[PDB]
């Protein structure tokens, strides 16, 4: 059950890091209009 | 942030004043910090520059090699009694178990200090002789201080502007690491514990667990 | 060979390419070891070499004076106040005093203040004459580093072709003497015993009794 916790923690940390750094990566610039 | 040219950041800020004339900011890490004056001669400046960079790299390696094993021992790696703290790591070879890497008995397991010192002397002497000569078997003529080639396999130093910025990054990381290495040297003889142990003791109560707790340790006694 | 661009160097072939341009090799004892670059300016190079030569001769005196009383005490049987070199200064404080051969009829000094005073005045005059290079007729000449006259009674200062050769010999074994006396200084603090005493303990068992056995004595607590 410890390795299940390790796997779930790794998965959650991975997806949260994707969320955070994707919104960091120039997110207001993805618009069809100017600015 | 314009680390070169005449408008580079200086060693004291707006209160620094005019930097020395020979410190034109051409070389990385040029803040003008030469208040002693041991770089008036350009040859002496070059020798001290390569000495400083070699010290920097050796200090990055040394600082990481001091910090890692004590954290590993605190994180479950079976460093037995004194291999965790750097100034007792050399004491591991005079026991029966020897240098057991990562606490594993069948890893390294070395007990001949004479032989390991000998092979270090020949190997490192060959390495430093190749470095000092600037020419090695299989290596052509190139920059002695910043060779690249086989020493930069990734080859991400090809761009000149990125190379200069990374040179500034390298010298600043080096200065920080060698400041930290002298911190380790002074902190070991003053406290008697590892640097991570000192950090953990300081984080418990920083009011009393500071450098002033050992200010009265070395007082002379009649 | 020891002179010119084909001279011996401090890293052998490893010193072939990167050699400082001001290490021409005209000056004796030149192996090209100025990798820290303290001697770019040849006036400070001249200063550094005269301090180097003075230290070389001084450490030749020192290294011959460290070994001689202890070798005479162990391998010749003569008794002294203390043949240990770092404990040979306190024997003037003993009731017997300081004896040159262990006999009270030789030297037999008891006044550390008086012997310090006479040593200071004699060596102050000698070193002031050396630094000034003589004055008022007597010894008001020469090069104040390799004098010759009034200092070479055996006539070996002549024949410059071999004179430079044993000058290189002088600098080389003076460097050996400085290295040996630094070893004496470090061995005094670490082992706490005389140099040939540690040598004799080394010959009994070189496997265990070495410098690494006492390497744990300076660990912080």
């Amino acid at each position: 059950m410890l390795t299940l916790k390790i796997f779930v923690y790794t998965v959650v940390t991975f997806f949260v890091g994707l969320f955070i750094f994707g919104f960091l990566s120039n997110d207001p610039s993805r618009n069809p209009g100017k600015g | 942030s314009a680390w070169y040219g005449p408008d580079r950041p200086l060693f004291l800020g707006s209160l620094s004043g005019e930097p020395p004339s020979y410190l034109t900011g051409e070389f990385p890490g040029d803040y003008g910090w030469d208040t002693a004056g041991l770089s008036a001669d350009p040859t002496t400046f070059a020798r001290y520059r390569t000495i400083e960079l070699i010290h920097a790299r050796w200090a990055l390696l040394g600082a990481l090699g001091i910090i890692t094993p004590e954290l590993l021992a605190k994180n479950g790696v079976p460093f037995s009694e004194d291999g965790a703290i750097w100034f007792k790591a050399g004491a591991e070879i005079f026991k029966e178990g020897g240098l057991n890497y990562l606490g594993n008995e069948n890893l390294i397991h070395a007990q001949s200090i004479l032989a390991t010192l000998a092979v270090q002397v020949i190997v490192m002497g060959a390495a430093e002789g190749f470095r000092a000569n600037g020419e090695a078997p299989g290596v052509e003529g190139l920059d002695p201080l910043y060779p690249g080639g086989p020493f930069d396999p990734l080859g991400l130093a090809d761009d000149p502007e990125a190379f200069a910025e990374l040179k500034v990054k390298e010298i600043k990381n080096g200065r920080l690491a060698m400041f930290s290495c002298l911190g380790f040297f002074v902190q070991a003889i003053v406290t008697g514990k590892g640097p991570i142990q000192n950090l953990q003791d300081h984080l418990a109560d920083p009011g009393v667990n500071n450098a002033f707790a050992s200010a009265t340790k070395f007082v002379p006694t009649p | 060979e020891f002179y010119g661009p084909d001279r011996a160097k401090f890293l052998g072939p490893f010193s072939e390419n990167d050699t400082p341009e001001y290490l021409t090799g005209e000056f004796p004892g030149d192996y090209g070891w100025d990798t820290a670059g303290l001697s770019a300016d040849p006036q400070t190079f001249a200063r550094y070499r005269e301090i180097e030569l003075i230290h070389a001769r001084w450490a030749l005196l020192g290294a011959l004076g460290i070994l001689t009383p202890e070798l005479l005490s162990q391998y010749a049987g003569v008794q002294f106040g203390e043949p240990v070199w770092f404990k040979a200064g306190a024997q003037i404080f003993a009731a017997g005093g300081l004896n040159y051969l262990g006999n009270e009829s030789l030297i037999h000094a008891q006044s550390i203040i008086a012997t310090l005073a006479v040593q200071v005045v004699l060596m102050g005059l000698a070193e002031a004459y050396r630094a000034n290079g003589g004055s008022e007729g007597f010894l008001d000449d020469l090069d104040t580093l390799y004098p010759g006259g009034a200092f070479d009674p055996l006539g070996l200062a002549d024949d410059p072709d071999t004179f430079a050769e044993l000058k290189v010999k002088e600098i080389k074994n003076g460097r050996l003497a400085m290295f040996s006396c630094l070893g004496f200084f470090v061995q005094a603090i670490v082992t706490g015993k005389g140099p040939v005493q540690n040598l004799t303990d080394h010959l009994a068992d070189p496997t265990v009794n070495n410098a690494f056995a006492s390497a744990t004595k300076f660990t912080p607590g």
Binding site: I6, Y9, T10, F14, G17 | N75 | -
Partner: protein, 44 residues
């Protein structure tokens, strides 16, 4: 005790970790994603 549990619930464990390996994998995953983002920022 008839069965084995970690018993890590409660006690105010930081980020819920009861072993150092959990904090290490969290830090390693964040560092890997940060390194990828940093070396691959600004669309290269």
């Amino acid at each position: 005790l008839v069965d084995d549990r970690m018993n890590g619930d409660g006690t105010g464990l930081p980020f819920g970790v009861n072993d150092g390996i959990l904090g290490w994998v969290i830090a390693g995953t964040l560092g890997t994603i940060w390194a990828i983002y940093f070396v691959s920022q600004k669309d290269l």
